[PDB]
């Protein structure tokens, strides 16, 4: 009888653990829904064509300043390639303004498919040894990772 | 100025140093971590970081300071808790509400805004003053006055001395003019952590320590300004001896610098000493926090901070000795310090020596210990003060072949060698009386002679009895007490009585909390007199038997005196010397009645 | 007595299981409601952080 | 805070020796920066930066180095130190070595990321272990007791049942104050961290925790022997960080069982050897003391919070000794030492705890008239003395013969027999109340006459010598 009641208590504990695990899994599922919605919004952001160019210029400036390399080779999606080709030397001028350095000899070819890119640029350096992945999908999942505690704090009830 | 190149553990190599002298403290990174130079190879210089090095970049700026490791002195240094790099811990805990110690905190070692009372020592305008002269006294707290002295590297004529009143360390309390130029002085005094403070001349100590514990104060004494070494044992040792040296010692102040020890033990010490109402004055119950100071650096603290903690502790000892007090510094460190040297030496890729310790371990331990000794102070008035170094050694689990142990015993004058076997048997003071020694037994001759002109002989007799018992213990372990004669039997009886009555002490009760010298010497004289009289009686051989028959006669028909002897340890010191002395004199008279009354009927 | 005790234990276990299921359903409903309420603000904050560059 | 930067990705893996990959031509390399390694096959490992020098940087890899190529192996600098996510949901779950959940559940939703090797506690803010926890085992309760916030490492050798007694302590640990102590905060919320454990031991601990009804309370971080070696040098740090968050920032008393610290010294040895550093004793790294201090000094009550952390790191001596560097340093740092002797196991006593080598520095604080019988210290100090002197007597009688022994010698031998048999031995599932343990100890003591009881004071004798 003692071991029967002990096994019954163990079964009750296992049921409680299963219930709490189901609750936690539903929480994670809601977080995944949040991530999917954020990805959809990020994809929708690519529809713009005027502030989108400014954002691309800012991204390329940030990446080139982070590498601080003599010769990068930027890679951009075939879609909106015209925007990158248009911004062109503006980024080089901005970088040369940032510090007293000769303008980088950028090179722009192969492009990854749209959904893989979803905006943003990959800059890298000659021989591809050092790679900077400033894709919009890459900026996301880092902001998400950092802000996740704030997300849980927002999910009080 | 300079920038980081390499970051491995706590060793950082920063290029661009060029003219960066050795041990010139540098500040590393945006977080501004303290740090001392340890090696140079050209434009780059190795640095010890004294803090966690996680998160250092490459080309992260490093700023030089041109100043070696320095501790800030002055009023309020007493009764505080400082990190190894001398950060006020309570100040950090209050100023920042966070309970943690944040990385790279920059807090002054001493508060620069507290108002302190100033009492100039009759120094007139146009007078001549010199290094270490004692121009003003400040009452840091009741029952502990703090004299203020000029730094040893200062001199000049007194153009302006501040009047008596409330002052803060930011104010200039004194002005001097020398060699055609003038200099100012505040109540602060920065001093390099190494390069010990100057002394007019050293002296040979004569006053004993007279600590609370009976074994230490009687068998293996230490002099004020002496040098000791206990094997850092727990339950005993690091706790009971520390308490005796802190709250029940004649040293005018205490400096506990135990670093590289357990955090729970440090918290217990730092929470128990706040109350600690020791009767240091004649009729006052002032807490010893107005008398001591902690330089605690736990084990988890950075490895490079151990040497800094030890040297700051000994430097603080020097400031007080210079004022005039007889400071006594206790270091639960020097067991973790050797480990710190091994860590830094190995990381610096130094060639190891015997047993892997750096070859210069003896040199460092000497440069630390040899800063002890009573010293005639600098400046006017004439004055005298001392520093005592009761350090720690590896626990009694390793033989004396340990390089740290051999290095200590090659320098230390008094060895309170605690034995683990006594700790198993729960003998709490735990000093092994066969292996301990005190080279100060010759200098204390005058004090022993003046206190009691017959103590030396009774001490030698007690030593002989203990040695004889330890000698024939091996023989008994083979044959047994069957062959033991009258002399051997009485010697073992007296040795057992001495071991359980004299050499033990509970220290958790008023019977053995603090045994004054008079009570201890009276116990010794009583026991030795009993031994001598019993030996004479058994040598008389009256009644045709004498001998062991007389021994049984005195152990049975005269055993009340024996019980009073073994219970003499319970004479309450609170009753006062005129009462305990009378009680012991009466017990001595009763003992003299025995072995004469026992000889009356010829056994 | 033993049969009654085991029957009562089985009934109590069933009641506890039902209570756990009801509490789980309530918790899932609460979490879904909160996520639906705060999703747009969360996504707006995320996009604002993603779509900004300094220098 | 303003804008972020996506982590750089490199390919210049110019050197791979053992558990270390040596990157090159890197810029802005943080120290202890956590890196992500994507191999040619596409699997992702995670590593740490042990050393930064010029443009180079040496990276150890947790999951091993079985596939790195100088051409395809991509490494990415996250630019931050390790941060294990923590939440109240972390209770009642079982994890891998590095924190990945292995309970088939979802990953932790973090309340916050707390950097490993958490911020140092200013000693001016700690408090000495005040309350005592009842260990159930009588030998621990009567001598070598354990107070909340203590660091008691169980010293054992290969084959001894250290895991069994650890599980018994986990099942039996509880408060003692006036025998009065729901207590959900009083529930010890055990955090169990196993490093280098045979799979049988892990299954045993899992089953014991499940059976004891604590599955909603305990937490398991496992680094099995077959699991990569390097993760053993991170698992206890993760466990201690989780314990710190569960205790200090959540107000729960927390108990920690680090298992096989020698399996951590082995990881230290492997890492140090792989870096060609100067060795120490027996070839162990010269800074093993610093690492052991960092891993032990993270337990103890804190003044500003109602929580507490009490850890019981069990240890395995290599050749059943103490001079070995790891048990030696652990004895130096930790405030206690419980000794399990092969001699007792050979005599078939389930708790083989040798009460003579045992020691607890904070024993004098846990006991007292306010929470224990007034005679506890006397009782312990007398049993210890009689056992030690009786052992000496038995050693003497081993050569002089049983006939040469005296009446006191026979009393001491009988005391030894009944102490090692009736007192030390205890049921594998039966506890002993502290007062019941003291009653048993008094029964053991009352063998000797009142005269021989030198340590016990007469005041406690009058109230207890008869009972």
HEC string of B325-350 equals: CEEEEECCCCCHHHHHHHHHHHHCCC
Over its C-alpha atoms, chain C yields an Rg (Å, rounded) of: 23
CB D287 to CB B303 under 8 A? yes
Vertex B244, ends B238 and B249: CA angle to 5°? 135
A:D CB pairs within 8 Å: 80
Q: Report which of D90, D82, D77, D89 is spatially closest to residue D12, judged by C-alpha positions.
A: D77
Vertex B350, ends B344 and B355: CA angle to 5°? 85
Q: Which residues does residue D10 pair with via DSSP β-bridges, in sequence order?
A: A130, D75
Give me B436's structure tokens: 């301990």
**A–C touching, 3+ CB–CB pairs within 8 Å:** yes
User: In whole angstroms, how far apart are CA B397 and each of B230, B423, D322?
Assistant: 13, 12, 9
The arrangement of strands across the sheet holding B156-161 comes to: B127-129, B156-161, B172-178, B181-186
User: Is D282 in contact with D266 (CB distance < 8 Å)?
Assistant: no
Residue linked to tokens 């990705």: D9
- For residues A6-39, b (16+ Cβ closer than 10 Å) or e, as one string? eeeeeebbeebbebbbbbbebbeebbeebbebbb
Q: Is D128 left (phi over 0), alpha (psi -120 to 50) or beta?
A: beta
Q: Report which of D332, A88, D242 is spatially closest to residue B234, judged by C-alpha positions.
A: D332
Mutation pick from A72, A117, A118, A152 vs chain D, by most beta carbons of D within 10 Å, is A152
CB D53 to CB B56 under 8 A? no
Give me D271's structure tokens: 């890492």
DSSP E strands: which ranges in B156-267?
156-161, 165-167, 172-178, 181-186, 189-192, 201-202, 227-230, 253-256
CB D10 to CB A131 under 8 A? yes
The arrangement of strands across the sheet holding D146-147 comes to: D146-147, D132-134, D174-175
State the Cα–Cα distance between residues D125 and B90, nearest whole angstrom: 8
Using the Cα atoms of residue A76, residue A82, residue A84 and residue A89 in order, give the sign of their dihedral: positive
Q: Report which of B588, B554, B596 is spatially closest to residue B571, judged by C-alpha positions.
A: B588
The number of beta carbons lying within 10 Å of the beta carbon of residue B1 is: 13
CB D2 to CB C54 under 8 A? yes
Please report which helix (H) or strand (E) contains residue B215, including its range: helix B214-218
User: In whole angstroms, how far apart are CA A89 and each of A50, A55, A92, B103, C52?
Assistant: 17, 15, 5, 44, 21
| Greatest C-alpha distance within chain C | 80
Considering only CB atoms, which chain A residues are within 8 Å of C50?
42, 136, 139-140, 143
Give me D203's structure tokens: 């299954």
State the Cα–Cα distance between residues B155 and B68, nearest whole angstrom: 23
Q: Report which of D362, D302, D301, D292 is spatially closest to residue D327, judged by C-alpha positions.
A: D292
Using the Cα atoms of residue B474, residue B475, residue B480 and residue B482 in order, give the sign of their dihedral: negative
Residue linked to tokens 């621990």: D140
Considering only CB atoms, which chain A residues are within 8 Å of D103?
21
Separation in Å, CA of B422 to nearest CA in chain D = 10
State the Cα–Cα distance between residues B439 and D48, nearest whole angstrom: 55
Pairing state between β D44-53 and D56-61? antiparallel
Q: Is residue C7 classed as helix, strand or coil in its secondary structure?
A: helix
Considering only CB atoms, which chain D residues are within 8 Å of A128?
11
Residue linked to tokens 């502290």: D434
State the Cα–Cα distance between residues D141 and D376, nearest whole angstrom: 10
State the Cα–Cα distance between residues A1 and D352, nearest whole angstrom: 32
Considering only CB atoms, which chain A residues are within 8 Å of D110?
148-149, 152
State the Cα–Cα distance between residues D76 and D79, nearest whole angstrom: 9
State the Cα–Cα distance between residues B47 and B40, nearest whole angstrom: 9
Crossing angle of helices B547-556/B517-540, nearest 10°? Answer: 130
Residue A130: partners with Cβ closer than 8 Å, 6 or more residues away = A67, A69, A124, D8, D9, D10, D11, D12, D25, D27
Q: What are the residue ranges of helices labelled H in B442-516?
A: 445-451, 455-478, 486-497
User: Is D158 in contact with D201 (CB distance < 8 Å)?
Assistant: no
Interface membership of A99 toward C (CB under 8 Å): no
Vertex B571, ends B565 and B573: CA angle to 5°? 150
User: In whole angstroms, how far apart are CA D359 and each of A119, D142, D336, D340, D352?
Assistant: 66, 12, 5, 12, 15
Residues in chain B: 603
Give me B254's structure tokens: 């205490």
Q: Is residue B417 classed as helix, strand or coil in its secondary structure?
A: coil
State the Cα–Cα distance between residues D302 and D128, nearest whole angstrom: 9
The arrangement of strands across the sheet holding B116-120 comes to: B144-149, B134-141, B116-120, B165-167
State the Cα–Cα distance between residues B132 and B151, nearest whole angstrom: 6
Binding residues of B: 232-239
Q: Report which of D94, D311, D108, D88 is spatially closest to residue D206, judged by C-alpha positions.
A: D94
CB A19 to CB C6 under 8 A? no
User: Is B321 in contact with B385 (CB distance < 8 Å)?
Assistant: yes
Residue linked to tokens 């290094």: B131
Give me A74's structure tokens: 């930027």
Mutation pick from B30, B267, B398 vs chain D, by most beta carbons of D within 10 Å, is B267
Burial class of residue B153 in the structure, from the number of CB atoms within 10 Å of its CB (0-12 exposed, 13-18 middle, 19+ buried): exposed
Alpha carbon dihedral B222, B225, B230, B233, in 10-degree steps, equals 110
Over its C-alpha atoms, chain D yields an Rg (Å, rounded) of: 25
Q: Report which of D151, D136, D147, D152 is spatially closest to residue D340, judged by C-alpha positions.
A: D152
Burial class of residue A141 in the structure, from the number of CB atoms within 10 Å of its CB (0-12 exposed, 13-18 middle, 19+ buried): middle
Considering only CB atoms, which chain A residues are within 8 Å of D23?
none
Neighbours of chain D (3+ CB pairs under 8 A): A, B, C
* Closest residue of chain A to D211, computed from CA coordinates: A10
Residue linked to tokens 């200590």: B408
Neighbours of chain C (3+ CB pairs under 8 A): A, D
DSSP E strands: which ranges in D290-408?
308-311, 315-317, 336-340, 353-360
Using the Cα atoms of residue D258, residue D260, residue D261 and residue D266 in order, give the sign of their dihedral: negative
Interface membership of D345 toward A (CB under 8 Å): no
Q: How far is CA D442 from the centre of its chain?
A: 31
Give me D162's structure tokens: 């250290």
State the Cα–Cα distance between residues B157 and B491, nearest whole angstrom: 70
User: In whole angstroms, how far apart are CA B579 and each of B502, B524, B584, D270?
Assistant: 20, 18, 9, 68
Give me D418's structure tokens: 């009944």
The answer to whether the peptide bond before residue B381 is cis (omega within 30 degrees of 0) is: yes
Residue B169: partners with Cβ closer than 8 Å, 6 or more residues away = B74, B75, B110, B111, B112, B114, B116, B186, B187, B188
Q: How far is CA B205 from the centre of its chain?
A: 16
Q: Report which of B595, B374, B346 is spatially closest to residue B490, judged by C-alpha positions.
A: B595
User: Is D72 in contact with D11 (CB distance < 8 Å)?
Assistant: yes
Residue B405: CA count within 13 A, CB half-sphere: 17
Q: Report which of D76, D134, D22 is spatially closest to residue D376, judged by C-alpha positions.
A: D134
Interface membership of B510 toward D (CB under 8 Å): no
Neighbours of chain A (3+ CB pairs under 8 A): C, D
Pairing state between β D174-175 and D132-134? antiparallel
State the Cα–Cα distance between residues A149 and A143, nearest whole angstrom: 11
Give me B539's structure tokens: 């040598």
CB B265 to CB D361 under 8 A? yes
State the Cα–Cα distance between residues B479 and B489, nearest whole angstrom: 14
Give me B587's structure tokens: 């017990």
Please report which helix (H) or strand (E) contains residue D155, including its range: strand D154-157
Nearest to A28 among D8, D27, D106 (CB): D106
Give me A151's structure tokens: 């997300």
User: In whole angstroms, how far apart are CA D262 and each of B166, B261, B579, D259, D425?
Assistant: 60, 21, 60, 9, 27
If you write DSSP's letter for every residue of A2-55 in order, what string do you get?
HHHHHHHHHHHHHHHHHHHHHHHHHHHHHHHHHHHHHHHHHHHHTT-SSHHHHH
Q: Which residues does residue D467 pair with via DSSP β-bridges, in sequence order?
A: none
Give me B143's structure tokens: 């029952």
Q: Is residue D295 classed as helix, strand or coil in its secondary structure?
A: helix
Alpha carbon dihedral A31, A36, A38, A43, in 10-degree steps, equals 170
Pairing state between β A130-132 and B26-28? unpaired
Interface membership of C54 toward D (CB under 8 Å): yes
Interface membership of A79 toward D (CB under 8 Å): no
CB D213 to CB A10 under 8 A? yes
Interface membership of A37 toward D (CB under 8 Å): no
Residue D284: CA count within 13 A, CB half-sphere: 22
Residues in chain A: 157
Mutation pick from D3, D6, D89 vs chain C, by most beta carbons of C within 10 Å, is D3
State the Cα–Cα distance between residues B462 and D464, nearest whole angstrom: 37
Residue B397: CA count within 13 A, CB half-sphere: 18
Give me A142's structure tokens: 């880092």
**Phi, psi (rounded to 5 degrees) for D443:** -60, -40
* Closest residue of chain D to A137, computed from CA coordinates: D6
Q: Which residues does residue D113 pair with via DSSP β-bridges, in sequence order?
A: D85
CB C24 to CB A5 under 8 A? no
Pairing state between β B165-167 and B116-120? antiparallel
Interface membership of D2 toward A (CB under 8 Å): no
Q: Which of residues 102-161 of D touch B (CB under 8 A)?
A: 117-129, 149-151
Nearest to A132 among D4, D6, D87 (CB): D6
Binding residues of B for ATP: 232-239
Q: Is residue B407 classed as helix, strand or coil in its secondary structure?
A: helix
Q: How far is CA B569 from the centre of its chain?
A: 26
Residues in chain D: 467
**D–B touching, 3+ CB–CB pairs within 8 Å:** yes
User: Is D139 in contact with D360 (CB distance < 8 Å)?
Assistant: no
The number of beta carbons lying within 10 Å of the beta carbon of residue C5 is: 12
Vertex B277, ends B271 and B281: CA angle to 5°? 140
Q: Report which of B140, B26, B82 is spatially closest to residue B257, judged by C-alpha positions.
A: B82
Interface membership of A7 toward C (CB under 8 Å): no
State the Cα–Cα distance between residues A22 and C25, nearest whole angstrom: 10
Q: Which residues does residue D115 pair with via DSSP β-bridges, in sequence order?
A: D83
B:D CB pairs within 8 Å: 183
Q: How far is CA D84 from the centre of its chain?
A: 20
User: Is B128 in contact with B157 (CB distance < 8 Å)?
Assistant: yes
State the Cα–Cα distance between residues B99 and D123, nearest whole angstrom: 10
Vertex D102, ends D97 and D103: CA angle to 5°? 140
* Closest residue of chain C to D6, computed from CA coordinates: C50
Q: Report which of D300, D314, D215 is spatially closest to residue D253, judged by C-alpha positions.
A: D300
Burial class of residue D148 in the structure, from the number of CB atoms within 10 Å of its CB (0-12 exposed, 13-18 middle, 19+ buried): buried
Interface membership of A138 toward D (CB under 8 Å): yes
Give me D435's structure tokens: 């007062």
Tell me the three-class secondary structure of B63-93, residue by residue: EECCCCCEEEECCCCCCCEECCCCCEHHHHH
Residues of chain A with a following break (C to N over 2.5 Å): 108
Q: Report which of A48, A117, A55, A93 is spatially closest to residue C54, judged by C-alpha positions.
A: A55
Q: Which of residues 329-368 of D touch B (CB under 8 A)?
A: 331-335, 356, 359, 361-362, 364-365
User: Is B328 in contact with B280 (CB distance < 8 Å)?
Assistant: no
The arrangement of strands across the sheet holding D94-95 comes to: D94-95, D219-224, D191-197, D253-259, D308-311
State the Cα–Cα distance between residues B508 and B475, nearest whole angstrom: 37
CB C43 to CB A34 under 8 A? yes
Q: Is residue D396 classed as helix, strand or coil in its secondary structure?
A: helix
Considering only CB atoms, which chain A residues are within 8 Å of D9?
130-133
Residue B558: CA count within 13 A, CB half-sphere: 22
* Closest residue of chain D to C52, computed from CA coordinates: D3
N- to C-terminal Cα distance for chain B?
A: 94
Give me D21's structure tokens: 């990959």
Please report which helix (H) or strand (E) contains residue B529, including its range: helix B517-540
Residue B418: CA count within 13 A, CB half-sphere: 30
Give me D140's structure tokens: 């621990």
State the Cα–Cα distance between residues D236 and D342, nearest whole angstrom: 28
Alpha carbon dihedral D151, D152, D157, D160, in 10-degree steps, equals -130
Using the Cα atoms of residue D454, residue D455, residue D459 and residue D464 in order, give the sign of their dihedral: negative
Mutation pick from D4, D6, D109, D245 vs chain A, by most beta carbons of A within 10 Å, is D6
* Closest residue of chain A to D27, computed from CA coordinates: A67
User: Is B12 in contact with B59 (CB distance < 8 Å)?
Assistant: no
Vertex B9, ends B407 and D284: CA angle to 5°? 55
- For residues D13-45, b (16+ Cβ closer than 10 Å) or e, as one string? beebeebbbebeebbbbbbbbbbebbbeeeeeb
Vertex B169, ends B164 and B170: CA angle to 5°? 110
Separation in Å, CA of A20 to nearest CA in chain D = 9
Nearest to B266 among D118, D123, D364 (CB): D123
State the Cα–Cα distance between residues D145 and D360, nearest whole angstrom: 7
Over its C-alpha atoms, chain B yields an Rg (Å, rounded) of: 28
User: Is B560 in contact with B576 (CB distance < 8 Å)?
Assistant: no
CB A130 to CB D25 under 8 A? yes
> What was the structure determination method?
cryo-EM
Interface membership of B263 toward D (CB under 8 Å): yes
User: Is D292 in contact with D329 (CB distance < 8 Å)?
Assistant: yes
CB D215 to CB A149 under 8 A? no
DSSP E strands: which ranges in D251-399?
253-259, 308-311, 315-317, 336-340, 353-360
Give me B222's structure tokens: 């230490």
State the Cα–Cα distance between residues D158 and D342, nearest whole angstrom: 9
The number of beta carbons lying within 10 Å of the beta carbon of residue A5 is: 12
Separation in Å, CA of B103 to nearest CA in chain D = 8
Interface membership of A123 toward C (CB under 8 Å): no
Give me B238's structure tokens: 């690091």
């Amino acid at each position: 009888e003692k071991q029967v009641e002990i096994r019954k208590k163990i079964e009750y504990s296992m049921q409680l653990n299963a219930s709490r695990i189901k609750v936690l899994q539903a929480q994670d599922d809601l977080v995944s829904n949040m991530m999917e919605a954020a990805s959809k919004e990020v994809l929708n952001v690519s529809r713009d064509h005027n502030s989108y160019k400014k954002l691309l210029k800012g991204l390329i400036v940030q990446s080139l300043l982070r590498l601080k390399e003599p010769a990068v080779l930027l890679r951009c999606r075939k879609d909106d390639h015209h925007l990158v080709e248009s911004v062109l030397e503006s980024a080089k001028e901005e970088y040369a303004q940032k510090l007293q350095v000769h303008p980088p000899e950028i090179i722009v070819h192969h492009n990854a498919h749209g959904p893989s890119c979803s905006g943003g640029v990959v800059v890298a350096s000659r021989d591809g040894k050092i790679v900077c992945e400033n894709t919009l999908d890459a900026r996301l999942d880092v902001v998400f990772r950092k802000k996740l505690p704030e997300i849980r704090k927002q999910l009080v009830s | 100025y300079g920038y980081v190149r390499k970051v491995s553990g706590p060793v950082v190599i920063a290029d661009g140093m060029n003219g960066a002298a050795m041990y010139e403290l540098v500040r590393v990174g945006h977080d501004n971590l303290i740090g001392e130079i340890i090696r140079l190879e050209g434009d780059s210089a190795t640095i010890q970081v004294y803090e966690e090095t996680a998160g250092l970049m490459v080309n992260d700026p490093v700023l030089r300071t041109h100043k070696p490791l320095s501790v800030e002195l002055g009023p309020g240094i007493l009764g505080n808790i400082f990190d190894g790099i001398q950060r006020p811990l309570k100040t950090i805990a209050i100023r920042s509400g966070d309970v943690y110690i944040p990385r790279g905190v920059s807090v002054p070692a001493l508060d620069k805004d507290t108002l302190w009372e100033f009492q100039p020592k009759k120094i007139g305008e146009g007078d001549l003053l010199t290094g270490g002269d004692l121009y003003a006294t400040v009452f840091e707290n009741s029952l502990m006055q703090h004299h203020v002295a000029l730094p040893p590297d200062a001199m000049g004529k007194v153009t302006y001395v501040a009047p008596a009143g409330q002052y803060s360390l930011k104010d200039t309390v004194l002005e001097l003019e020398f060699q055609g130029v003038k200099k100012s002085f505040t109540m602060l005094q920065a001093w390099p952590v190494r390069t010990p403070r100057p002394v007019s001349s050293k002296l040979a100590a004569d006053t004993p320590l007279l600590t609370g514990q009976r074994v230490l104060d009687a068998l293996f004494p230490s002099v004020l300004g002496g040098t000791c070494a206990i094997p850092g044992a727990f339950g005993c040792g690091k706790t009971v001896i520390s308490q005796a040296l802190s709250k029940y010692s004649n040293s005018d102040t205490v400096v506990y610098v135990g670093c590289g020890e357990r955090g729970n033990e440090m918290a217990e010490v730092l929470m128990d000493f706040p109350q600690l109402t020791m009767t240091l004055p004649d009729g006052r119950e002032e807490s010893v926090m107005k008398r001591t100071t902690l330089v605690a650096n736990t084990s988890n603290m950075p490895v490079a901070a151990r040497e800094a903690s030890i040297y700051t502790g000994i430097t603080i000892a020097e400031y007080f000795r210079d004022m005039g007090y007889n400071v006594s510094m206790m270091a639960d460190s020097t067991s973790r310090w050797a480990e710190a040297l091994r860590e830094i030496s190995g990381r610096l890729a130094e060639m190891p020596a015997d047993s892997g310790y750096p070859a210069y371990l003896a040199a460092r331990l000497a440069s630390f210990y040899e800063r002890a000794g009573k010293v005639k102070c600098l400046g006017g008035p004439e004055r005298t003060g001392s520093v005592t170094i009761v350090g720690a050694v590896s626990p009694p689990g390793g033989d004396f072949s340990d390089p740290v142990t051999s290095a200590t015993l090659s320098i230390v004058q008094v060895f309170w060698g605690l034995d683990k076997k006594l700790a198993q048997r729960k003998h709490f003071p735990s000093v092994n009386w066969l292996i301990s020694y005190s080279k100060y037994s010759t200098a204390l001759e005058s004090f022993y002679e003046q206190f009691d002109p017959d103590f030396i002989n009774i001490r030698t007799k007690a030593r002989e009895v203990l040695q004889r018992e330890d000698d024939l213990n091996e023989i008994v372990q083979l044959v047994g007490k069957d062959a033991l004669a009258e002399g051997d039997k009485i010697t073992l009886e007296t040795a057992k009585l001495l071991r359980e009555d004299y050499l033990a002490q509970n220290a958790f009760t008023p019977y053995d909390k603090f045994c004054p010298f008079y009570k201890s010497v009276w116990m010794m004289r009583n026991i030795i007199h009993f031994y001598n009289l019993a030996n004479q009686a058994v040598e008389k051989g009256a009644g045709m038997d004498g001998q062991k028959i007389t021994y049984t006669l005195i152990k049975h028909r005269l055993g009340d005196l024996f019980y009073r002897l073994v219970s003499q340890k319970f004479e309450d010191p609170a009753e006062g010397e005129p009462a305990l002395v009378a009680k012991f004199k009466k017990l001595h008279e009763d003992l003299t009645a025995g072995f004469r009354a026992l000889e009356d009927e010829t056994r | 007595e033993f049969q009654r005790k085991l029957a009562e234990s089985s009934g109590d276990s069933g009641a506890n299981v039902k209570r756990l299921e009801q509490e789980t359903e309530v918790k899932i409903h609460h979490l879904n409601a909160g996520a639906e309420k705060i999703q747009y603000d969360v996504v707006q904050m995320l996009l604002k952080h993603v779509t900004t560059v300094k220098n | 805070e303003g804008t972020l930067e996506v982590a750089m990705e490199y390919r210049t893996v110019t050197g791979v020796a053992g558990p270390l990959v040596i990157l090159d031509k890197v810029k802005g390399p943080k120290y202890y920066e956590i890196v992500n390694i994507r191999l040619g096959d596409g699997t992702m490992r995670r590593g740490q930066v042990l050393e930064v020098d010029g443009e180079k940087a040496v990276v150890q890899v947790f999951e091993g180095t079985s596939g790195i190529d100088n051409k395809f192996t991509t490494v990415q600098f996250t630019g931050e130190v390790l941060k294990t996510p923590v939440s109240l949901d972390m209770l009642g779950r079982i994890f891998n070595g590095s924190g990945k959940p292995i309970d088939n559940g979802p990953p932790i939703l973090p309340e916050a990321y707390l950097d490993i090797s958490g911020s140092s506690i200013n000693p001016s803010e700690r408090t000495y272990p005040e309350e005592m926890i009842q260990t159930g085992i009588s030998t621990i309760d009567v001598m070598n007791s354990i107070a909340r916030g203590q660091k008691i490492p169980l010293f054992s050798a290969a084959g001894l049942p250290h895991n069994e007694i650890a599980a018994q302590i986990c099942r039996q640990a509880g408060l003692v104050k006036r025998l009065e102590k729901d207590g959900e905060e009083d529930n010890f919320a055990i955090v169990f961290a196993a490093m280098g454990v045979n799979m049988e031991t892990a299954q045993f601990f899992k089953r014991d925790f499940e059976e004891n009804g604590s599955m909603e309370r305990v937490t398991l971080f496992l680094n099995l022997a077959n699991d990569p070696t390097i993760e053993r040098i991170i698992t206890p740090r993760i466990a201690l960080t989780t314990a710190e968050y569960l205790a200090y920032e959540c107000g729960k008393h927390v108990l920690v069982i680090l298992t096989d610290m020698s399996s951590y010294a082995d990881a230290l040895r492997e890492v140090s050897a792989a870096r060609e550093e100067v060795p120490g004793r027996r070839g162990y790294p010269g800074y093993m003391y610093t690492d052991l201090a960092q891993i032990y000094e993270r337990a103890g009550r804190i003044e500003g919070r109602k929580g507490s952390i009490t850890q019981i790191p069990i240890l395995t001596m290599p050749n059943d000794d103490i001079t070995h560097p790891t048990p030696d340093l652990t004895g130096y740092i930790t405030e206690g030492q419980i000794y399990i002797d092969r001699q007792l196991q050979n005599r078939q006593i389930y708790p083989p705890i040798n009460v003579l080598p045992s020691l607890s520095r904070l024993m004098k604080s846990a006991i007292g008239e306010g929470m224990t019988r007034r005679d506890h210290s006397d009782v312990s100090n007398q049993l210890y003395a009689n056992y030690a002197i009786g052992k000496d007597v038995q050693a003497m009688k081993a050569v002089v013969g049983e006939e040469a022994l005296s009446s006191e010698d026979l009393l001491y031998l009988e005391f030894l027999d009944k102490f090692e048999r009736k007192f030390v031995a205890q049921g594998a599932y039966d506890s002993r109340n502290i007062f019941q343990s003291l009653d048993l100890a008094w029964t053991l003591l009352r063998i000797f006459p009142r005269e021989l009881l030198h340590r016990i004071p007469g005041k406690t004798l009058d109230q207890y010598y008869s009972r």
